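User: Predict the full complex structure for these chains.
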Amino acid sequence: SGLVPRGSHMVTLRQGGGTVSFTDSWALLPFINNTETPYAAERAEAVTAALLHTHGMQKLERTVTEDRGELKQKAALEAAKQKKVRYAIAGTVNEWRYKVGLDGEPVAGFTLQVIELPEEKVVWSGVAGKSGWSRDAVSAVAQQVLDSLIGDLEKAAA
Amino acid sequence: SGLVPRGSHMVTLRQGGGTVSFTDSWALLPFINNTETPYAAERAEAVTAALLHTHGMQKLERTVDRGELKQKAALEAAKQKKVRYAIAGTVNEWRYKVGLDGEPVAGFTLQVIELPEEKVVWSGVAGKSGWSRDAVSAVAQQVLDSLIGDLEKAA
Amino acid sequence: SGLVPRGSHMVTLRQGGGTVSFTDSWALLPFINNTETPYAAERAEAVTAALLHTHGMQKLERTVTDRGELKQKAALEAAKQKKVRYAIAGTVNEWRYKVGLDGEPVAGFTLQVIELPEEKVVWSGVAGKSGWSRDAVSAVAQQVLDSLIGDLEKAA
Amino acid sequence: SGLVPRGSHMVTLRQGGGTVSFTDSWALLPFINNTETPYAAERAEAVTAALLHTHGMQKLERTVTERGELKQKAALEAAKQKKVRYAIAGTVNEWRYKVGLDGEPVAGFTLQVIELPEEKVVWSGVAGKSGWSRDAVSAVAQQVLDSLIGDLEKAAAT
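Assistant: Here is the predicted structure of the four-chain assembly.
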């Protein structure tokens, strides 16, 4: 035996006033990497950018690549202020790994904050995570989790 | 200005070994309604039936708080019909919760039962509350789709 | 027969600051009631107040009188117009005895701590629980609020 | 500015109308260890045993130890030969102090209560918790197992 359940959780919260618009001006900051997996922040950012475009966010300021990235993210927030973007997405990778034990479980987790600029007010935030089955890649579990979060942001954007 | 987070949760468990083929012979039992919403189980069974077709479960027998006798009746009907796997489902939540705004809520517990031994080969619990614009059935369909999607990820 | 799992979940976030807490000046605002149970917000405030005392918060300012949102705005100014450093803002998300196959008490809450010079949220928590038939809703609520408060205490 | 939420989750499921009694004959099997933490199953078993006694379960068969799957099967067989009514079969899913932006001790467990001799599962539970940096992993584990054992007690009736 061995009991190895799989699971996924997501919590999101909307604050502020009226709707936030995906047609407004957006920035996607560098992710902070809170895992032992090198380059998880960069892969999380690439997956997130592609999902945002898919969901219809065309005007998305991004930061070319190149340490957990706290300073890069702070500096990118300042760059978004100077570019006069309305909303910045600040993301942290909480988990990104292929746990091997009795079987294989890819895990991925993220926390996302949407910050309205210039006032630096959080208008939405979300936390989600998922563990998969042995045949799933970590990248597919991460894409699912970020798809749920962005799908929720779009709905909660009202 | 209340804080009303939205959330979803899913936990699933595979207990036996070996494959579970969606091409084999399947049965979707009637659902048990554990809500104050009349016909929650009928709506759930119908949504569940449509999703299993989409996921490629082509041989799917169907037959015919409330519902506990009907489900007991239908698994024997399933065993006597020689279907290999029965899906026993319960509706844990199905309502449009009205408060500061609208939160549709739906939740379910599913068990796959291998026949004739009657061993639970997979089970899952999941639930989700969504935003005001969503209908309960759309939330329900999402929850049921995640469950069915997880079940499929078992060979 | 029917399969009705019970469950609890808690998520908690320290939004920023490497500060501390607790023997400072604290305010427990009135709760917002996002349930169909009358008095849920008052009951939730009284349970939280007791738990806060139990967890050492000796200096705690309190406020006297889908509902309750306007009162909570008013109390945040009282703490603001007083010297209050930290304000606890709570919402009751769930408070009912769900009657299906069997009894199922359910309680859930969202809490934020606001640092009250400049209204910065330094901690937020959401938690909820459903119990077994022989548990009272109030006992389930106290367990959930105790988990949130004990977490807030450890996150400092 | 990284976002590192802390969290705990528990899901339990009762299957069967019979009242299970803590004054009955019980066995605690060796845990299965689905982590990379040495001795995590042995420590899980010892915490669980002390919590069960605390919750009033005085007649508790235990196994002396030498991922543990064969040990758990053999102990289930020995419990049957001892004519115990209920065997607790546990898996350690997580037990580690994760070091990222800060420390997070993490523990998680899946428990099954098996009624013998029929080998029917009358209760099952999964729970997990990530804590704050000043917390020890064993304190997080003890909290998680106490929540599971407290739920089994309440679910069991008497």
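The interface with chain A takes residues 9, 11, 13, 110, 121, 124, 126 of chain C (CB under 8 Å).
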